Design a protein around this ligand. Structure first.
Ligand SMILES: N[C@@H](CCCC[C@@H]1CO1)C(=O)O
Ligand SMILES: N[C@@H](CCCC[C@@H]1CO1)C(=O)O
Ligand SMILES: N[C@@H](CCCC[C@@H]1CO1)C(=O)O
Ligand SMILES: [Mn+2]
Ligand SMILES: [Mn+2]
Ligand SMILES: [Mn+2]
Ligand SMILES: [Mn+2]
Ligand SMILES: [Mn+2]
Ligand SMILES: [Mn+2]
Lengths: 313, 313, 313
């Protein structure tokens, strides 16, 4: 498809800094070229320059609110631009707090978007339910219209406007959900397939239901926010908050291959890849290679093979 | 639920001794605290003191019959006690020969119990069919009423009374079954899901059929005897008789999460964890961590999340 | 069943030479004995002596055409012999180019054979579509009647006669298919289950459809060409062209256990095991052990257990 690459070297949504290297190691893995090696029209909007905000004391327990709120605000504008250019936005990021700006900017051009969130976590803590204060675990709370009222005025986010309903999002891969988050899950009726549902139904049925659930009433643009820690750490170890028992490399590709086939992918986030956290050089390459593979699947690379519309014989 | 912890540091059901450390490393992993950290009422009945039986020569090929028969006899009494106290017995053990006493004592208070046996092995060899002579591979033969007649008078087990029928037990995870054992399997019509059935049906259907098979006619207490070598050695390597191609960490949790949801768990055995057999310190922690995870799942810990009955928002 | 072992220490179908050691390390793993330890009548036709062909320059891009064409020609004769002796041919090989002779010789005695090809690749490149020139990636193109016309007169293969139709073959495990190969796939209507279909349907349904697809109209002899790189490299690392995201050890055994149960297995190839490519001594033993396990499954070894027709009690 027509892609618009946007690097988001940001890490203040959490404590470990190496995550802002995500765009670099991914590009250095030949991501742009690989995409071009397919049927992809690729334009790199470069890495966004996230100005330093020296004065950013916590808002209550919440950390680096101004820099996070600013990075998402900046990212939101960029995504809206690439979307206005008729391209699928590919946000190579740092931490997942950036999802706030990516989904926000996407919904400005396509307010009817549906979101598929692959993650070991729900990232739906509010500034009042979070125990860690890390904003990469709160993005979803800022985007949900139903949680509009339980989100205090946090410095840096006054530009935010909830753009999606609890019913326009589906979670896949959950295995470490906080108590308040689970409460929000059940209270708002959010559709999710934790690792338990994946085990019960199999990833094939999981994807069937996910797409049917989001595209049933009518076809609508799809936003895929892929947190690499959604996959098992044996595949993506170089990430900040790994949790054992994750989705397999195969399941990761199955998810993306199916989304690609809908022809409705319009926004994509590949987040939380932190090279600095690899215990070895191999753990880093393994994490980056897996991250690239998932990305390519979103844009056509199929395991059964691919061929141009010509007579090869 | 209401739990009654009972440590069973015993190893004479087999050759390698480190298995009697099971209760120690598990407790030292914070098992009691972790359970309390949930909605669990926990009372530790301590570790049973298994007196040394210096004079215990083999009965034919069978090894350490008196100490094994004695340990199970002692364990049987303890379990019956905790069951009489309205608690779910949690037997942290050494080798699986202890299942004889755990299931025996359980059935004294709840004669209508159904058993789910997760294991790479059937542990149903008789003193006459066993080739190794290790009693941890014969527990089931002593408990089955139908095998009453093919079990010789082995020193230390005169207190035993078969308490379950071949139809009140279901095996899950089998992948190394001896010839005589397989014969007993097919001859008594025992329900089992070897790794082949798990591969064919998927763990979801496997659990559906298992519970339906055992709880169909009527709801009855459930005894789960979990041999950690039922899971693949990439998850539980620190165990005496590992067999490749086992159940996954995910499947292990799926099994237990489903059993928990029945609200019928009344007896649980977490066996065969041998710290001494870990090739590295990490293999030990990996085995113990997995063993703890499975245990917590049996008592409520869910991958989709958990929350108290309060308004978190 | 009645087996006829034939070693094929050949490697010129590709660049790395250690693959010709396949027969050796497999035999040294106790394969013959293990088979005999079952209900198998085993006769080893020894290792075929593949005379050196010093003068063998490439035919266009195709490498070592004369030695490859000769090795398959020799192998074809041997297989036909063992098949004429009422035995299931077990070809312990080097590279997969040998499939040309194995399937050719098999079809001479049983022209109605159906083929199950487990592989990460389709190995259906023609001498004109191949980019590497390695013949181990072209065997299928020489065997298909429908591709009769797109296969130039390559030195060493004038003895070849396409013996199977595109509809008498099923692929399982595909995850690295070239563009021209994919074109041939879709153009000839070849049935395949890439890793994507395995993920979607589960290996149980995959095998159900495969057998139904090949044995539907009528029961016919089965030829299983098993490329060990079809399984994930975490199980069979010592192989020339490994591809991540492969079939599991369990799936590998499920496939073979199901084929065995049809009672129609008549030809088997266990290919691409290259001991020289193991990064460690353990990677070699792990590859060989897995290869032996799959082989034993093809001839009866079942994970649920096995027993002779006698009264064990
Ligand atoms: N729920 C935990 C863990 C958050 C993980 C967030 C990562 C981005 O995906 C917290 O709120 O801190
Ligand atoms: N069937 C073999 C292996 C027994 C394994 C027993 C382990 C407890 O689970 C024997 O009888 O010695
Ligand atoms: N398709 C590639 C890779 C071939 C792999 C062949 C291995 C035998 O299974 C080629 O034609 O060279
Ligand atoms: Mn996460
Ligand atoms: Mn996340
Ligand atoms: Mn066992
Ligand atoms: Mn056991
Ligand atoms: Mn291959
Ligand atoms: Mn091959």
């Amino acid at each position: 498809r027509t892609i618009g690459i946007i690097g988001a070297p940001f890490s203040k949504g959490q404590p470990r800094g190496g995550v802002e290297e995500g765009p670099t190691v991914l590009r250095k893995a030949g991501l742009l070229e690989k995409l071009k090696e397919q049927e992809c029209d690729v334009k790199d909007y470069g890495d966004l320059p996230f100005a330093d905000i020296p004065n950013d004391s916590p808002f209550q327990i919440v950390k680096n609110p101004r820099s996070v709120g600013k990075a998402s605000e900046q990212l939101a504008g960029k995504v809206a631009e690439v979307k206005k250019n008729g391209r699928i936005s590919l946000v190579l990021g740092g931490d997942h707090s950036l999802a706030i700006g990516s989904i926000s900017g996407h919904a400005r051009v396509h307010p009817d978007l549906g979101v598929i969130w692959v993650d070991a976590h729900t990232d739906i803590n509010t500034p009042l339910t979070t125990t860690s204060g890390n904003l990469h675990g709160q993005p979803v709370s800022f985007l949900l219209k139903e949680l509009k009222g339980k989100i205090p005025d946090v410095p840096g986010f006054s530009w935010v406007t909830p753009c999606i309903s609890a019913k326009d999002i589906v979670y896949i891969g959950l295995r470490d959900v906080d108590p308040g988050e689970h409460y929000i899950l059940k209270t708002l009726g959010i559709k999710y397939f934790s690792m338990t549902e994946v085990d019960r139904l199999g990833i094939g049925k999981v994807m069937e239901e996910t797409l049917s659930y989001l595209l049933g009433r009518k076809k609508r643009p799809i936003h895929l926010s892929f947190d690499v820690d959604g996959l098992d750490p044996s595949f993506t170890p170089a990430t900040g908050t790994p949790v054992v028992g994750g989705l397999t490399y195969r399941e990761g590709l199955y998810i993306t291959e199916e989304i690609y086939k809908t022809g409705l992918l319009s926004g994509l986030d590949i987040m939380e890849v932190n090279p600095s956290l690899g215990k070895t050089p191999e753990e880093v390459t393994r994490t980056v290679n897996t991250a690239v593979a998932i990305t390519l699947a979103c844009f056509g690379l199929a395991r059964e093979g691919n061929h141009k519309p010509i007579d090869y014989l």
